[PDB]
Amino acid sequence: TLLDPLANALSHITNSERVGKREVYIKPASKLIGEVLRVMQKYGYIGEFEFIDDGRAGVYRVQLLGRINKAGAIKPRFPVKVSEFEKWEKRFLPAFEFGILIVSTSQGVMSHKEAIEKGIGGRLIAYVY
Amino acid sequence: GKKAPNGEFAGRKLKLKRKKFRWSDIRYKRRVLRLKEKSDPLEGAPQARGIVLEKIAVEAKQPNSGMRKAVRVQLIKNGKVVTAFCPGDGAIKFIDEHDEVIIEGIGGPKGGSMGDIPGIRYKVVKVNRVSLKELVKGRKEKP
């Protein structure tokens, strides 16, 4: 059973990247997935991404630019304050500011760097680098 | 499969699993039950005082060959009798029947028997409040 669309999507993205496929289709096109896809695109990991009206859940189509070493979902959604970033960031980014974490906060799903700039906590949802 | 549980709200099963499989360790199990403290003839004493009962030669384990001298000692602290090695060369002459000896551990693995000598656990340190190391060296003299 599909317990989670987001982790499956990120696993698919990484496995597609490793072989080197050009286009990736994400089957359970959820809103949180779309907000997620916006993020690393804003940071240049991917190119244009589009939604497709399939009539079941829609499908998210993305093209791969060969710039994603590994992407996954921090599953137990640990709540994190503003100061506790380096603790979790040391756990999921290979080096200092290498890659980005994604946080669901009061102001939306959005990048951990900008959250530090906004100085707002939230719940980690996924990591990619 | 994947390691479980992993949910945000499964602290209880994680803690219970860890407690359950911590007992399978032997070090922690020994410490909590204080089994050594129940089994120790020294009752936790690194050093103890006893009275020599007799002198025995024991054969070293193969392939080594040798006749290791040692003394049986009746413990003043609790009365239990234990065998203690006599270090040094020819030290057994200095030791005599009904001698107040002070023994400690021998230092084998897990505090057990050391080297090729099996079963022994302790070595004689002092005799009649004079140390065996000097007596074998001869610097001091037994009373």
């Binding site: 137990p76 640990f78 | 949910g7 945000e8 709200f9 499964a10 602290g11 209880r12 994680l14 803690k15």
Partner: protein, 110 residues
């Protein structure tokens, strides 16, 4: 009607009972909690229950914890099983009773 220093509405009925917060002689002081009545067998009594999530530091996970509180049910309110109620602290009513119901925020039928 007499105000208890807490922001709810009184029960319409007036009970002669001297232990009613709105119709008795006792008073209110201390903490106020929201709970669910899960036992009403003892007379003028309820065994409210309160749930919460207690954090753990070693595992960084939450644990579900339930706390029972024996509270005094006045006859005017007459809380029953499954009713979300507001419970407040009083002087020691009994060996286990140190609380009284203030109102019934949600009845069982809803």
């Amino acid at each position: 009607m007499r105000d208890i220093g807490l922001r709810v509405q009184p029960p319409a009925e007036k009970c002669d009972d001297p232990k009613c917060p709105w119709h008795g002689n006792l008073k209110i002081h201390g903490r106020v909690f929201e709970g669910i009545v899960v036992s009403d067998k003892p007379r003028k009594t309820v065994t409210v229950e309160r749930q919460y999530y207690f954090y753990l530091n070693k595992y960084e996970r939450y644990e579900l914890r339930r706390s029972k509180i024996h509270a005094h049910n006045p006859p005017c309110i007459n809380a029953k099983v499954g009713d979300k109620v507001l419970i407040a602290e009083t002087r020691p009513l009994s060996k286990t009773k140190h609380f009284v119901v203030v109102a019934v925020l949600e009845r069982a039928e809803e």
